[PDB]
Ligand binder design. Sequence first.
Ligand SMILES: *[C@@H]1O[C@H](CO)[C@@H](O)[C@H](O)[C@H]1NC(C)=O
Ligand SMILES: [Cl-]
Ligand SMILES: [Cl-]
Ligand SMILES: [Cl-]
Ligand SMILES: [Cu+2]
Length: 235
Amino acid sequence: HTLVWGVWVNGVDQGDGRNIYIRSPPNNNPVKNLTSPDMTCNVDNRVVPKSVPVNAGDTLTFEWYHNTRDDDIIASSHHGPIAVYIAPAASNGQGNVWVKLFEDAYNVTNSTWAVDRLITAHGQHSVVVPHVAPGDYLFRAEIIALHEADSLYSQNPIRGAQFYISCAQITINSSDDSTPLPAGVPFPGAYTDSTPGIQFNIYTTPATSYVAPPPSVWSGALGGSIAQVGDASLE
Ligand SMILES: *[C@@H]1O[C@H](CO)[C@@H](O)[C@H](O)[C@H]1NC(C)=O
Ligand SMILES: [Cl-]
Ligand SMILES: [Cl-]
Ligand SMILES: [Cl-]
Ligand SMILES: [Cu+2]
């Protein structure tokens, strides 16, 4: 159970974005229905009044929280992967539009899931803004908690993978458009009951065997990381 508070750009806090530049849902409940329109940008998908200005090559940091800013972030039970997608705003996230900029699942060296490292990062994970056409974009940050993912929601609605989905309105101003955005996948539509990484048993299956849901990360993606960029407690 987690939500996005706001974003940082190049290590500078853009301020509380809830219902302002984040299309915030009313609470931190997960989305579980893979076929639901709620998979696109969660349960209150509407245009919010601001869009955060960035340039290609900027570092865009999402900041998550549980109940209050810079708290326990997400229950340490909620092991799973993290991804970020982009689509043009014109789409409203409908159709084959979502392009993957970032994926982290299980790190063999540190023996840690993306979610474990997000807690250590005080809720902060980043992407580098790609060299796409200037204009208005949606960045969709997605955490998949796998603690009940031995079952499928479609078969047992009281279990299943849990999706914490947040859409940020981002305006890309300076970009030479040298890596124009390629075709995307649909949400809902990309994840189905047979997709690798949707049904998994984290209690019996080695985390080293976990494969995150496709699609693969776009070759045009400029970088990204789970790491604290800024100290919320200094405001
Ligand atoms: C899953 O979402 C689809 C599409 O909106 C809907 O028809 C179906 O009733 C949903 N399932 C549940 C259990 O609400
Ligand atoms: Cl749901
Ligand atoms: Cl960190
Ligand atoms: Cl980064
Ligand atoms: Cu939860």
